[PDB]
């Protein structure tokens, strides 16, 4: 029975190493993307303010043009 | 390869050495800069100890090594060890003789005049080097893109350099030298970990800190908002089961140390954040030079790979500075080898003859020949 | 050579026919059109003639160099790119085209759009196609071998579609390269049967770690469009260069003999000195060869031969010997020389074309035999151009594209990809490692090409 | 030795399931974030186009004002 258990243990550790490796690459991929997601989120917010500012200044210029 | 002397390419720092074969694009052998003793007694007969252990040999087995740091910003506690460190590079891996090919090195800005001559003495007198040169870190990372107007900030383990080299070099002061890079970060963490009980004492595990750092640790976007986030245990508590056998949940420890970068007040100095030093190098130059500097800011050095290092710059620079031009920072993706890319160039340039030093040139103008003529 | 060398053997004069028909054979595949000649060969060739025990020849090898590889992306109006791309279309059955994922419309692609021209007034490939096919099967290139070769272009045509819409993704740093239409980049890897994602992540992006082992490739380096397009082409060319030279060797598989080994009579044949009313970089390389060709004669009919006169001890005296022009050689070899100052600038990417120009006028225009506008006050020369005096007349050059076209630098990132692929050809195009060129592999091609020309001169000096 | 082999088989088989479980969850988390990242990237690029227009319109109004 020991010989049979040893055989099952050998292949078990091999599958374990493969599983952990797949998880290690998956958790890393999820991370780098999460960082990029937050990096893009900040860029989206800072530009969201610029877009509004760019619109308001345009409307203000039009109102300024109407006066003159 | 065969015809023509063919020169090598190298870039030595105060932490990691970069060197490969000849005519290459990137370093082929990057061994760590470590050399300690066997405070213990080697087995003493299970080899006549000596070899403080170095290269992948020492790094593989730190355990019984009292890692002695020879090169500390400027001062080299001992030169005798450096001789046998270079006797390993060119031969054990590259399998080529320096008594045949030229050599290229890097220059740490504002380094004692006596050092640049002591090194050359080792080459010309013993390693017989009829042709070599020592170029300036940052300037190399430059000549490798497509413009003659950019400001560069090159650093790694040695010291920080804010060099606005674009159209020319050296005028009033602009450039800055700050002893706060790499080794400084590795030294600061162990001190702060003591608050939680963890105390990586000896210099061997001190290196483990650096190893662990470059895998998960990141920079705080805003320490204020991230502090309140500590209440949650998802973005904070990070898993890293010690290869030995004891997990270290680096949660608030990851984005704590990097804060020192922007706040040098935590390391006993008056130096301001790296976004103030940026102004310090811009306000000095002419007035009609700024609008294009903001449009191009080169950030070299593998140190600038920490998550949350570039996005912070746009927040602090746009604050206390002119805001009607294109604020733009060029942070090369793999910016660690930016110096190596430029190094392979100088070694292949022909105009290089106008700059390099020849065997006889070292004897005619004496040892000072180098930095007495060039800059 | 024959008759003199010879005769009897029925398997001699008969196979001599297929060998004499080998000339027009290779003039239909690798050749293209030039304004100076229609049957313009587009591959270096230094043939070699061996002999048999009976008298007839046994076979010979072939060697090329550089290969013109800027015509695929850029050329003058009216001119036309390689023949294989156009003759193949107006011929193959529509059914054969669809199988390769092709549509009867050049503008739709990129490989044929980079020029802007498609139809030629003088050429009728629809009819000329039957002349090439008659050469395909007659020699010994069955459709099986043809399709095999087409599987390489089939991929290239799937890779060629990969165009870009200037991606200003990076908030600041450097504009990256985005590919929304991924099916082009997907089909690109479908033929190679490699991970579509990893491929783009391991090529367009450079990576290195290192530590006695051999690194873990993944780290990213997005770069500008020019460098991206540079890398794209750099591979597209060398991939086909090695094949053609290995193809002609396999054409000799049913021709070359391996029974005797003996003396070798060589025959030289290289691109000719073309002349337009408007030159550029690609002309320099061709015109440069002539500068070496003139040096060859002066080395032979004026030096090595004169030394033979006195060796015999026969009346001879040095009659007006015009300049041996070794200056034209030293001006572009040893330090402080053209290509030594040129290739050096090719690496200094921050030295574009205008700055590079200034590194020539100052370095020269003082050394003899080289003019420009500044020194020689002639309006015909532009402020950005210069006057290069050959051993013949005068030629002026432009600057458009100088760098990316000249650099040639091909690192081991675009090359290694195909090597690690799974296909009997993709790795086959890269034949048994180290064919007459080994030494050390990893190094810019700027020096590799320099060795190619040096392998041409050194082997011509010590001979008859 | 059999008891030890069986013991290692238990902890290995269990850790194997956990490793595989984590690999799926990590990939699951990667997917949901990747999708959002792409949506943001697209939305951001669209705003940039509007940002440029908003500025050009604002400038055009200013130039039109100077004339009057
Ligand atoms: N992938 C990485 N991410 C972040 N930091 C990294 C990474 N790889 C290396 N580093 C760090 O870069 C530094 C070494 O960079 P290097 O350019 O060799 O420095 P120096 O030349 O000053 O010795 C070390 O602090 C190391 O931890
Ligand atoms: Ca440094």
Q: If DSSP codes are grouped into helix, strand and coil, which group holds residue C167? A: strand
C-alpha separations of C324 from B60, B371, C138, C236, C431 in Å:
61, 42, 50, 41, 42
Of A41, A51, A61, the CB nearest to D61: A61
Residue in chain D closest to A22 (alpha carbons) equals: D23
Ligand 2 centroid, distance to B13 Cα (angstroms): 6
Asked if B242 contacts B205 with a C-beta cutoff of 8 angstroms, the reply is no
- Chains touching B, CB cut-off 8 Å, 3+ pairs: A, C
Both ends of chain B: CA-CA distance in Å? 32
Chain B contacts of A39, Cβ < 8 Å?
A: 311
Rounded to whole angstroms, the Cα distance separating C445 from B161 reads 34
Asked if B58 contacts B36 with a C-beta cutoff of 8 angstroms, the reply is yes
Chain B contacts of C446, Cβ < 8 Å?
A: 348
C210–B348: do the CB atoms touch at under 8 Å?
no
Helix (H) or strand (E) holding C249: helix C225-251
Residue B118 CA, chain-centre distance (Å), reads 21
Residue in chain B closest to A36 (alpha carbons) equals: B307
Ligand 1 centroid, distance to B136 Cα (angstroms): 19
Instruction: Indicate if ligand 1 lies below 6 Å from the C-beta of B336.
Output: yes
CA dihedral C142, C143, C146, C151 (to 10 degrees): -150
Instruction: Mark C335-369 as b/e (b = at least 16 C-beta within 10 Å).
Output: ebbbbbbbbbbbbbbbbbeeebbebbeebbbeeee
Rounded to whole angstroms, the Cα distance separating B160 from B180 reads 6
A35–B307: do the CB atoms touch at under 8 Å?
yes
Residue in chain D closest to A15 (alpha carbons) equals: D16
Rounded to whole angstroms, the Cα distance separating B215 from C354 reads 44
Q: How far is B195 from chain C (nearest CA, A)?
A: 34
Residues 281-340 of B with CB under 8 A from C: 310, 314, 327-334, 337
Rounded to whole angstroms, the Cα distance separating B350 from C360 reads 12
Residue in chain A closest to D8 (alpha carbons) equals: A9
DSSP string computed for A5-58? HHHHHHHHHHHHHHHHHHHHHHHHHHHHHHHHHHHHHHHHHHHHHHHHHHHHHH
Ligand 1 centroid, distance to B211 Cα (angstroms): 10
Residue B329 contacts by C-beta under 8 Å, 6 or more apart in sequence?
Answer: B297, B299, B310, B313, B314, B317, C172, C173
CATH topology for the B35-68 domain: Actin; Chain A, domain 2 (2.30.36)
Q: How far is B144 from chain A (nearest CA, A)?
A: 27
A:B CB pairs within 8 Å: 6
Question: Is D20 an 8 Å CB contact of chain A?
Answer: yes
Instruction: Indicate if ligand 1 lies below 6 Å from the C-beta of B210.
Output: yes
CATH 3.90.640.10-classified regions of chain B: 182-267
Residue C300 contacts by C-beta under 8 Å, 6 or more apart in sequence?
Answer: none
C-alpha separations of B349 from B133, B134, C30, C448, D19 in Å:
12, 14, 36, 16, 54
Strand-pair category, B297-300 with C265-269 = unpaired
Task: Give the closest ligand to the alpha carbon of residue B301.
Answer: 1
Rounded to whole angstroms, the Cα distance separating C263 from C257 reads 14
Rounded to whole angstroms, the Cα distance separating C167 from B93 reads 42
Instruction: Indicate if ligand 1 lies below 6 Å from the C-beta of B334.
Output: no
Q: Provide the 8-state DSSP code for C300.
A: I
In total, chain A counts a number of residues equal to 68
Quickly tell me which residue has 């990076």 as its tokens. C170
Helix (H) or strand (E) holding C396: strand C394-396
Nearest CA to B305 among B211, B217, B188, B240?
A: B217
Rounded to whole angstroms, the Cα distance separating C189 from C358 reads 43
DSSP string computed for D8-52? HHHHHHHHHHHHHHHHHHHHHHHHHHHHHHHHHHHHHHHHHHHHH
* Phi, psi for residue B75 in degrees, rounded to 5: -80, 130
In the CATH scheme, what is the code of domain B182-267?
3.90.640.10
Q: How far is D46 from chain A (nearest CA, A)?
A: 11
Asked if B281 contacts B245 with a C-beta cutoff of 8 angstroms, the reply is no
Q: List the beta bridge partners of residue B151.
A: B297
Number of the ligand 1 atom closest to the C-alpha atom of B15: 23
Residue in chain D closest to A6 (alpha carbons) equals: D5
Q: Which CATH architecture has domain B4-34+71-134+337-371?
A: 2-Layer Sandwich (3.30)
Asked if C280 contacts C400 with a C-beta cutoff of 8 angstroms, the reply is yes
Question: Is A35 an 8 Å CB contact of chain B?
Answer: yes
Both ends of chain A: CA-CA distance in Å? 99
In this structure, the number of other CB atoms found within 10 A of the CB of residue B274 comes to: 23
Q: List the beta bridge partners of residue B132.
A: B103, B357
HEC string of C398-460?
CCCCHHHHHHCCCCCCHHHHHHCCCCCCCCCCCCCCCCCCCCCCCCCHHHHHHHHHHHHHHHH
Q: If DSSP codes are grouped into helix, strand and coil, which group holds residue C279? A: strand
Rounded to whole angstroms, the Cα distance separating C168 from D46 reads 12
* Phi, psi for residue C439 in degrees, rounded to 5: 45, -105
DSSP string computed for C370-384? -B-TTTS--TTS-SS
Q: If DSSP codes are grouped into helix, strand and coil, which group holds residue C125? A: helix
Interior angle at CA C148, CA C147 and CA C153, nearest 5: 80
Ligand 1 centroid, distance to A51 Cα (angstroms): 38
Asked if B295 contacts B326 with a C-beta cutoff of 8 angstroms, the reply is yes
In this structure, the number of other CB atoms found within 10 A of the CB of residue B83 comes to: 11
Ligand 2 centroid, distance to B175 Cα (angstroms): 15
Instruction: Indicate if ligand 1 lies below 6 Å from the C-beta of B212.
Output: no
Rounded to whole angstroms, the Cα distance separating C323 from D62 reads 69
Rounded to whole angstroms, the Cα distance separating C217 from C134 reads 48
Tokens at B69, concatenated: 């740091």
Q: If DSSP codes are grouped into helix, strand and coil, which group holds residue C169? A: coil
Rounded to whole angstroms, the Cα distance separating A16 from D17 reads 9
Q: How many alpha carbons lie under 13 Å from residue B189 in its C-beta half-sphere?
A: 25
C-alpha separations of C104 from B330, C95, C101, C111 in Å:
44, 11, 10, 14
Strand order in the sheet with B177-178: B177-178, B160-163, B151-154, B297-300
B345–C348: do the CB atoms touch at under 8 Å?
yes
Q: If DSSP codes are grouped into helix, strand and coil, which group holds residue C48? A: strand
Residue C107 CA, chain-centre distance (Å), reads 25
Instruction: Mark C72-98 as b/e (b = at least 16 C-beta within 10 Å).
Output: bbebeeeebbbbbbbbbbebbeeeeee
The burial class, CB within 10 Å (0-12 / 13-18 / 19+), for C390 is middle
Rounded to whole angstroms, the Cα distance separating B234 from B335 reads 31
The burial class, CB within 10 Å (0-12 / 13-18 / 19+), for C217 is middle
Rounded to whole angstroms, the Cα distance separating B8 from B347 reads 7
Asked if B202 contacts B318 with a C-beta cutoff of 8 angstroms, the reply is no
Tokens at C430, concatenated: 């890269």
In total, chain D counts a number of residues equal to 68
Instruction: Indicate if ligand 1 lies below 6 Å from the C-beta of B38.
Output: no
Asked if C373 contacts C397 with a C-beta cutoff of 8 angstroms, the reply is no
- Chains touching D, CB cut-off 8 Å, 3+ pairs: A
Asked if A10 contacts D6 with a C-beta cutoff of 8 angstroms, the reply is no
A46–B307: do the CB atoms touch at under 8 Å?
no
Nearest CA to C239 among C410, C45, C108, C81?
A: C410
Asked if C124 contacts C139 with a C-beta cutoff of 8 angstroms, the reply is no
Question: Is A14 an 8 Å CB contact of chain D?
Answer: no
Nearest CA to C114 among C88, C90, C79, C89?
A: C79
Strand-pair category, B151-154 with B297-300 = parallel
Asked if C217 contacts C210 with a C-beta cutoff of 8 angstroms, the reply is no
Tokens at C314, concatenated: 């026969």
Residue C62 contacts by C-beta under 8 Å, 6 or more apart in sequence?
Answer: C45, C46, C47, C48, C245, C248, C249
Q: If DSSP codes are grouped into helix, strand and coil, which group holds residue C86? A: helix
Asked if C370 contacts C363 with a C-beta cutoff of 8 angstroms, the reply is no
Q: If DSSP codes are grouped into helix, strand and coil, which group holds residue C348? A: coil
Rounded to whole angstroms, the Cα distance separating C1 from C55 reads 10
Round the CA-based radius of gyration of chain D to a whole number and report it.
29
In this structure, the number of other CB atoms found within 10 A of the CB of residue C209 comes to: 12
Instruction: Indicate if ligand 1 lies below 6 Å from the C-beta of B258.
Output: no
Where does C324-376 have alpha helices with state H? 327-330, 338-347, 354-361
The burial class, CB within 10 Å (0-12 / 13-18 / 19+), for C372 is buried
Rounded to whole angstroms, the Cα distance separating C182 from C286 reads 39
Asked if B140 contacts B298 with a C-beta cutoff of 8 angstroms, the reply is no
Helix B80-88, helix B113-125: angle, nearest 10: 50
Helix (H) or strand (E) holding C240: helix C225-251
Chain D contacts of A68, Cβ < 8 Å?
A: 65, 68
Rounded to whole angstroms, the Cα distance separating B293 from A40 reads 25
HEC string of chain B?
CCCCCCCEEEEECCCEEEEEEECCCCCCECCECCCEECCCCCCCCCCCCCCCCCHHHHHHCCCCCEECCCEECCEECCCHHHHHHHHHHHHHHCCCCCCCCCEEEEECCCCCHHHHHHHHHHHHHCCCCCEEEEEEHHHHHHCCCCCCCCEEEECCCCCEEEECCCCCCCCCCCCCEECCCCHHHHHHHHHHHCCCCCCCCCHHHHHHHHHHHHHHCCCCCCHHHHHHHHHCCCCCCCCCECCCCCECCCCCCCCCCCHHHHCHHHHCCCCCCHHHHHHHHHCCCCHHHHHHHCCCEEEECHHHHCCCCCCCHHHHHCCCCCCCCCCCCECCCCCCCHHHHHHHHHCCCCHHHHCCEECCHHHHCCCCHHHHHCC
In the CATH scheme, what is the code of domain B136-181+271-332?
3.30.420.40
Q: List the beta bridge partners of residue B22.
A: B8
Rounded to whole angstroms, the Cα distance separating C39 from C373 reads 37
Q: If DSSP codes are grouped into helix, strand and coil, which group holds residue C267? A: strand
Asked if B263 contacts B152 with a C-beta cutoff of 8 angstroms, the reply is no
Residues 328-357 of C with CB under 8 A from B: 335-337, 340-341, 343-344, 347-352, 355
Rounded to whole angstroms, the Cα distance separating C398 from C382 reads 9
Round the CA-based radius of gyration of chain B to a whole number and report it.
22
Q: Provide the 8-state DSSP code for C108.
A: G
Tokens at C427, concatenated: 């790795």
Tokens at C85, concatenated: 């791309």
Of A6, A16, A58, the CB nearest to D19: A16
Rounded to whole angstroms, the Cα distance separating B228 from C74 reads 59
Task: Give the closest ligand to the alpha carbon of residue B109.
Answer: 2
Tokens at B244, concatenated: 């030995």
Question: Is A46 an 8 Å CB contact of chain B?
Answer: yes
Nearest CA to C336 among B364, B356, B371?
A: B356
CATH 3.30.420.40-classified regions of chain B: 4-34+71-134+337-371, 136-181+271-332
What method was applied to determine this entry?
Answer: cryo-EM
DSSP string computed for D42-59? HHHHHHHHHHHHHHHHHH
Rounded to whole angstroms, the Cα distance separating D38 from D35 reads 5
Q: What's this structure's resolution in Å? A: 7.8
Which residue, by CA, sits nearest to atom 24 of ligand 1?
A: B182
Instruction: Indicate if ligand 1 lies below 6 Å from the C-beta of B214.
Output: yes
Rounded to whole angstroms, the Cα distance separating C131 from B261 reads 73
C-alpha separations of D67 from A68, C371, D61 in Å:
11, 52, 10
């Amino acid at each position: 029975e020991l010989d049979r258990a040893q055989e099952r243990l050998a292949t078990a550790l091999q599958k374990l190493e493969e599983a952990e490796k797949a998880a290690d690459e998956s958790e890393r991929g999820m991370k780098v993307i999460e960082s990029r997601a937050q990096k893009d989120e900040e860029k989206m917010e800072i530009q969201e303010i610029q877009l509004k500012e760019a619109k308001h200044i345009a409307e203000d210029a039009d109102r300024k043009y109407e006066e003159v | 390869d065969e015809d023509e002397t063919t020169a090598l390419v190298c870039d030595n720092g105060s932490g990691l050495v970069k060197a490969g074969f000849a005519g290459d694009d990137a370093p082929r052998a990057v061994f760590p800069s470590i050399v300690g003793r066997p405070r213990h007694q080697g087995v003493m007969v299970g080899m006549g100890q000596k070899d403080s252990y170095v290269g992948d040999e020492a790094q593989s087995k730190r355990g019984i090594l009292t890692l002695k740091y020879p090169i500390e910003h400027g001062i080299i506690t001992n030169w005798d060890d450096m001789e046998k460190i270079w006797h390993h590079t060119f031969y054990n891996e590259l399998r080529v003789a320096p008594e045949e090919h030229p050599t290229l090195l890097t220059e740490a800005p504002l380094n004692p005049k006596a050092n640049r001559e002591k090194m050359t003495q080792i080459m010309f007198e013993t390693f017989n080097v009829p042709a070599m040169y020592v170029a300036i870190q940052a300037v190399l990372s430059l000549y490798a893109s497509g413009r003659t107007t950019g400001i560069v900030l090159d650093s790694g383990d040695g010291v920080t350099h804010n060099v606005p080299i674009y159209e020319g070099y050296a005028l009033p002061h602009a450039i800055m030298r700050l002893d706060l890079a790499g080794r400084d970060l590795t030294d600061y963490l162990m001190k702060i970990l003591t608050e939680r009980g963890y105390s990586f004492v000896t210099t061997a595990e001190r290196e483990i800190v650096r190893d662990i750092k470059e895998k998960l640790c990141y920079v705080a976007l805003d320490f204020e908002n991230e502090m309140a986030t500590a209440a949650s245990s998802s973005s904070l508590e990070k898993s890293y089961e010690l290869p030995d056998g004891q997990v270290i949940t680096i949660g608030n420890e990851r984005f704590r140390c990097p804060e020192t970068l922007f706040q040098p007040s935590f390391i006993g100095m008056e130096s301001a954040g790296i976004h103030e030093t940026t102004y310090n190098s811009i306000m000095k130059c002419d007035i009609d030079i700024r609008k294009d500097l903001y449009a191009n800011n080169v950030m070299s050095g593998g140190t600038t790979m920490y998550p949350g290092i570039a996005d912070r710059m746009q927040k602090e620079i746009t604050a206390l500075a002119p805001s009607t031009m294109k604020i733009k920072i060029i942070a090369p993706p793999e910016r660690k080898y930016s110096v190596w890319i430029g190094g392979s160039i100088l070694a292949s340039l022909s105009t290089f003859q106008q700059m390099w030093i020849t065997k006889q040139e070292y004897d005619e103008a004496g040892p000072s020949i180098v930095h007495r003529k060039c800059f | 050579l024959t008759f003199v060398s010879s005769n009897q053997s029925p398997n001699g004069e008969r196979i001599s026919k297929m060998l004499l028909d080998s000339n027009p054979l290779l003039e239909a595949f690798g050749n293209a059109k030039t304004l100076r000649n229609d049957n313009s060969s587009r591959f270096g060739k230094y043939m070699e003639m061996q002999f048999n025990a009976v008298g007839s020849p046994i076979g010979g090898k072939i060697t090329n160099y550089l290969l013109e590889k800027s015509r695929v992306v850029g050329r003058t109006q009216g001119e036309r790119s390689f023949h294989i791309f156009y003759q193949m279309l107006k011929g193959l059955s529509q059914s054969k085209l669809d199988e390769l994922g092709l549509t009867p419309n050049a503008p739709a692609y990129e490989y044929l759009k980079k020029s802007g021209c498609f139809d030629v007034s003088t050429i009728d490939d629809s009819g000329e196609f039957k002349i090439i096919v008659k050469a395909m099967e007659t020699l010994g290139l069955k459709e099986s071998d043809q399709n095999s070769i087409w599987r390489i272009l089939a991929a290239i045509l799937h890779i060629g579609n990969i165009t870009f819409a200037e991606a200003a993704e990076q908030r600041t740093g450097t504009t990256t390269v985005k590919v929304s239409d991924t099916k082009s980049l997907a089909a690109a890897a479908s033929c190679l049967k490699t991970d579509q994602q990893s491929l783009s992540i391991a090529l367009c992006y450079r990576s290195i770690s290192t530590g006695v082992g051999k690194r873990c490739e993944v780290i990213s380096v997005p770069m500008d469009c020019n460098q991206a397009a540079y890398s794209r082409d750099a591979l597209a060319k060398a991939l086909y260069e090695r094949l053609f030279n290995w193809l002609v060797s396999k054409i000799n598989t049913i021709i070359n003999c391996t029974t005797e080994k003996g003396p070798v009579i060589g025959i030289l044949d290289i691109y000719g000195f073309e002349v337009f009313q408007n030159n550029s970089f690609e002309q320099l390389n061709i015109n440069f060869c002539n500068e070496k060709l003139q040096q060859l004669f002066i080395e032979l009919t004026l030096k090595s031969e004169q030394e033979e006169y006195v060796r015999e001890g026969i009346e001879w005296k040095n009659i007006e010997y015009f300049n041996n022009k070794p200056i034209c050689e030293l001006i572009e070899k040893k330090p402080i020389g053209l290509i030594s100052l040129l290739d050096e600038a090719c690496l200094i990417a921050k030295s574009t074309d205008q700055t590079f120009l200034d590194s020539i006028c100052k370095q020269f225009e003082k050394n003899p035999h080289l003019q420009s506008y500044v020194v020689s006050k002639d309006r015909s020369i532009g402020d950005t151009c210069f006057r290069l005096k050959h051993y013949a007349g005068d030629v002026t050059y432009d600057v458009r594209g100088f760098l990316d076209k000249n650099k040639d630098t091909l690192f081991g990132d675009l090359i290694s990809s195909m090597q690690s692929s799974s296909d009997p050809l993709v790795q086959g195009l890269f034949p048994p490692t180290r064919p007459e060129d080994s030494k050390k592999r990893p190094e810019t091609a700027g020096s590799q090409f320099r060795n190619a020309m040096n392998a041409l001169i050194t082997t011509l000096l010590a001979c008859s």
